[PDB]
Every structure is written in C-alpha cells, then in structure tokens.
Symmetry: D2
Amino acid sequence: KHTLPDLPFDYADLEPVISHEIMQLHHQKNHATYVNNLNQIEEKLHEAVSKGNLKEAIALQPALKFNGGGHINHSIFWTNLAKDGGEPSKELMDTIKRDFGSLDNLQKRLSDITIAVQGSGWGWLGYCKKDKILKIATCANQDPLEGMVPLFGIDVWEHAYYLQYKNVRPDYVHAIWKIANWKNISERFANARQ
Amino acid sequence: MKHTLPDLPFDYADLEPVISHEIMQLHHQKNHATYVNNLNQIEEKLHEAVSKGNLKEAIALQPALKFNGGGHINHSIFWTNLAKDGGEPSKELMDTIKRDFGSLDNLQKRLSDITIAVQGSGWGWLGYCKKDKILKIATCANQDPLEGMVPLFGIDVWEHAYYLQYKNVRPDYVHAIWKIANWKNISERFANAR
Amino acid sequence: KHTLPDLPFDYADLEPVISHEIMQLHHQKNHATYVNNLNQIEEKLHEAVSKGNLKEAIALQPALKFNGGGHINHSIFWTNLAKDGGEPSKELMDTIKRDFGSLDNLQKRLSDITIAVQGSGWGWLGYCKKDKILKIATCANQDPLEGMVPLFGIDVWEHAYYLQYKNVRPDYVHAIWKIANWKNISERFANARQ
Amino acid sequence: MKHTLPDLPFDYADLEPVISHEIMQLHHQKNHATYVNNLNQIEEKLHEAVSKGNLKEAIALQPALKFNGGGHINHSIFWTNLAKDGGEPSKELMDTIKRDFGSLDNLQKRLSDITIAVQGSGWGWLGYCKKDKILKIATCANQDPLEGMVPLFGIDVWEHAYYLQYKNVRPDYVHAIWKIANWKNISERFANAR
Ligand SMILES: [Mn+2]
Ligand SMILES: [Mn+2]
Ligand SMILES: [Mn+2]
Ligand SMILES: [Mn+2]
C-alpha cells in the first residue's frame, strides 16, 4: 500500500518561514490521513470494479481524487522546500525570463493567484510540454495539477499557515519564496524538458 | 467483463407519436453505443493506471468514466422506463406518491418543471431515498448518475432526446413523455428499493 | 454599506468549546474581511451593470457569492452559538423526532456530513417550506444555504477550529452541539413555519 | 437599457450546405431570442434584489444571469464569426498563428479536437491573452462566457447547433465549420485585442 514519505529535513528546519508545529502536524497528521484514507478507498474501488458495480465505482471517485491528490500534492511539496535551496538553474531562469519577463514578475503573478484562491487549494508553477512554456495555475482542494508537469507548489489550505500566520495568508505566500527549493524545482524542470 | 449495449424491450417505432422511430434509433444505436464503447476503453486505461500505480493518471481518467459509465447507467434504465402500454403505479407506489407529493398529477408537474429548467444537457429523476424512506425528485447534469437515492423513473433532456421531433420546444417533450412512462417497471424498482 | 455585526456575547464566552483567540480572529479578521470585500465588489458590479458591461458583471459573480455568502453565513453563525442556549422548543423537538427519529440521530447525521466536507465549507440544519420537512445539507466554501431556510450552521473552515483542535475536526463538530443556541434555532424554526 | 436580439449579418440560408437554413433560423429566432428574453427578466430580478438588500436572493440569481447572459454574449459573437465569403487571416494574425501554433492547419486541428471532446453542451474558442501576448485555445461548458482572454472565434457545439443536419456526427460539423469562419471579423477582433 501507499506510504507516508519521510521529510527531507527536520520539522524545525524551515523556521522562521514555517513553524515546527505546522510542519509536524502537516506531515504526521494531514498527509498521513490522506495516505490512510487513500489506501482504504483504493480497496473499496477495487471491490466495486471487480464485482461490476459501476455506479458505486463512480460514487467513490471524489474520495480517490481528494485523498490521492492529497498524497500527490504533499509528496511534491516536501521536496519543494528547503532551508538552503539555492537559486534557479541557468536554464530555468532563462525560461522564467522568456515566459514571465523576470523571476520577480513570476513570484508576483503566482503569489497573486495563490492568495486569491477562495477556500482551500494550491498554487503551482508548472511546465507544459505541448506548448513548451511555463505556466501558473491554481487547484481547488486536493485536485492534482493536470495538463502540465508540476514544478513548485504552494499549499494554501489554512492548515498550512494558520497556527503561525493566523488569517494573514499573503504574508505566508510572500514568505514561502524564501524557502523554495530551487535545486528540486530545477531538477523537475530538467526532467520535464526530456 | 466487457459492457454491452442492451437490446431495447421494444421496436424503434413503438413509442410514436410521443418519441419518433428516428430518435429512438439514433439514441440507442449511436448515442448509447458510443457510451458503451468509450466506457470499455476507459475501464481498460483505468485498470492499467491502477495496476502501474499511476495515481495522477487514474484520477485524470475519472471524468471520462463518470460521463461514459453514467451514460451507460442512465440510458440502460431509461429503456426499461418506457412503454406504449405503461399500465399504472402499483397500490403501494401510488399510496407513497400521494403521501410524499399529494397526488400523481402534482408529482408529474413538479418533476416536469425541474426537468424543463435544466440548463444544458441532463436528466430529471424520480427516486426513492431508503434512509428517509421517502420519494424524492432531482436533476442531474450531463450523464452524472443519480446519487443518494435509488432511481425509479428518468427523463433524458439532452437535446438529442427530442430536437429532431420537438425542435426547441422541450416542454412539449417533457409533458408528453408521461404518456409512455412504464409504471410496471417503476413499481418493480420501487418494490426492490423497499 | 454592509457592516460587521457585533457578537451577541464576549469573545471568551464559548470556552471551552471555542477559544477566545479563535472567536476574536474569526469575528474581527475573517468576517470583517468578507464584509470589506463584499462592499468593494458590490461597487464594481454596480459599475458594470450601470455601464452595460455584461461580461464583466458575470465575471464578478464568484467574488460576490464568496464574500456575500461569507457575510450571510457568519451573521447567522454568531446567533446560533451561546454559552447557555437551552434546549429545542417543544415544536422543534417534535419535528426533529418526525423527520430524524431523535435529536441524537439528527446530531449524528449532521455531524457526519459536516465532518465529511472535503476542503472548506459548512454544515446546515434547514427547514424546507415546500416539502414542510427538516433537512440537512452541506455547502462548499462560503456558498449560502439555498432551497431551505437556515436554522443551525456549523462552520468547518479550518480557521473555525485549527488553533484549538488542530487537525481534529471531528472533536470540534461533536463539541459544538454543547453550545448550540437552541433559543435562536427554535425562533428561526418558528419564523420558517410562518 | 433592455438587451435585444441582433439581426444576423446574412440571410438564414447563406451558410448552406455547411449549416442549414432551418438550423440558422431556429438557432437565431428561438434559441438566442430565449436567452435575450430571459436575460432581461433576470436583470430585473437582480436589480430588485440589489435594491432591496436581498443578498441571498441576488446570489441565487447568478446561475441564471451567467447562463442567459452568456448565451447572449456567445451567440452575438458567433454570428459575426460566420460568413460564406470568409476571406483570410490578416498578415499580423497569420504570423501570430504561425508563432503560437506552428501553422493554421495545426490551430484548426487543435481547436477542432478539444471542441469535439466537449462532454455535454458547450463551446470551443480561439482567444488572445493580452497579458502573455499570445493566442490560446479553450472550451467552455454550457453558455459560460470565455474568461481570461479576448474571444476571437467561437464554435457552438450544443446539439442544437448541428443535430438536425449532422445527427450524432459532431466531428463532421466541427471540421466543416472552418469553411465559413469569418476571418475578416476575426482579424478585426485580433487587431482590437492588440
Ligand atoms: Mn496541506
Ligand atoms: Mn440520451
Ligand atoms: Mn468562518
Ligand atoms: Mn447555440
């Protein structure tokens, strides 16, 4: 079955941007719950599919998307954060400049759509292989990023920030750029180009 | 095993002048057939994604399974719901109808109204909620199957279900279809639901 | 313009079920923000409507639903909570028993659907004037309860509980029944019947 | 002021054999007319709700405004987008087409494919994104207007736009419509967008 991946750092390593308690709960409780429920839903869906219960299989889809998406999204997120993540590779910077003018503009545009999410969700920087272009998007709830390869995600569920930032989501979204793991994001970019 | 197109319980022209032989023919042989063919292919792709552990790909296939699978579910029910010689609601069904909607005429008006009001493609339904032990009415978008209640009688209001015969005049179609509601089938489904 | 209503109690009066800091932020920050943004969006929508910019008016709808809904929902919520809210009136209890069997069953069923909300939203007990029946429902994000009269709401946005309960939404949803303002809920029921 | 049904820029039979006189006639005189009539009524109800301060009622009217208003918007554009004597894309539009899609034939294939794939009722669009200064393609559900980009060319794939002539065979319709794309209008709209 699916497993909760270990974090690539210790729970306090992203302070002062994200607190120890937030990281601990987010990993050990929130992500764990998506994993546990994902495993259960896959079992129920298998039973429905194997027995020919099409209506029930369809009825189970939202729970698979939510918990499956939760596992997908958090798994990427932990790799996207670092205490010392460096700067974009030269190839990614050049592409950011082509597609957004500058890193400043990319940060502002993605922060803005991310901040604007109504309710729970995620902001993403992605790479579209078909159009050979960087794109930004948001996703509701735990819906996974579709139609482009995920490069950098920003979780704006309230659980991601509230204990530290309270209501002030913009401060969290602006601050998270300080701990963006550009080594990882650049590796994902390089893999997305191949 | 592979899904198949169910034979209709009557010949393509049996429902005239309420529904034309050409509508029935296209509706069964092209529309339903396409949902069945696409459903089989989508189930194969989903089975591959599940077996490979491609969770993102499995989630991405969900809309196509809901649409084609729902199409199969809905139309398969819809054929059993139609007859030239409808008959009448069983005693127990008529009594529950009077209980929950006051009269059959009220039920017909109320279901007809919501069905006519559908914006875009969809369906209207009479169902039975086992939990509350009551009859309810609802609409569904596109081919979304009826959820939360057991389906008893469905009215397809996709433009393909009427445009050839009724043109833009959907209310004529929805009012007329009551003349061919298969109450024998509906009472059976009600009995099974209780 | 719209205004932030004063709470009918002091910020610590719902302890130990809901904390002082949660109540203070929820009222002074979260609800205030919906009010402020609601006022701004109404202005922009007026300009679009008055100048004949239909496309722009439509584009502004989600922001009106979200902030408007936020104002509607929180305004009801503050009246629905009390340190000593009593018990249901006799007329409401009788109706709860008719429509749900018992208060216990109602609490369990509404708590269950409320707990199950994926992402941000609300659980509601409402009264449907047409069917003359109590119903339970959930709403996503700040979508207002539609199709029935709201009687009792449970906010399950993470901001409603996280500072105190952390991830453990079920404990908050089960506990909130201890501070349900049955005087208010019963008054709303009596008004909904007229 | 009150919305009105715009005259078509051509006679109902001018587009044959690609689109039939009966389709054009019904499409303009019944479908578009109904969106216009319903839009006027909904705007009145909305104006009343706003003026009374009935915020819940104003929010509840939003789906009907989006559907009927979008219907008006979309079809009004669609008539200007069709011609027997289309002409050809301006130099500047053809050059941008080659830039963003490689060729016109690629653009046609790509837009045709997504338009054909619409599940239920909707539209396909060529638009211009002013922010990124690029051409994009998209689909919309039901009568949702195209958002985030300026509309240039729209293809209506509601079954009413083709079933009388093409029956179930939507791809014939979508491929054929390119023979009557009004490139003079599209280049104008492109010019205006830049
Ligand atoms: Mn999270
Ligand atoms: Mn059909
Ligand atoms: Mn709240
Ligand atoms: Mn149309």
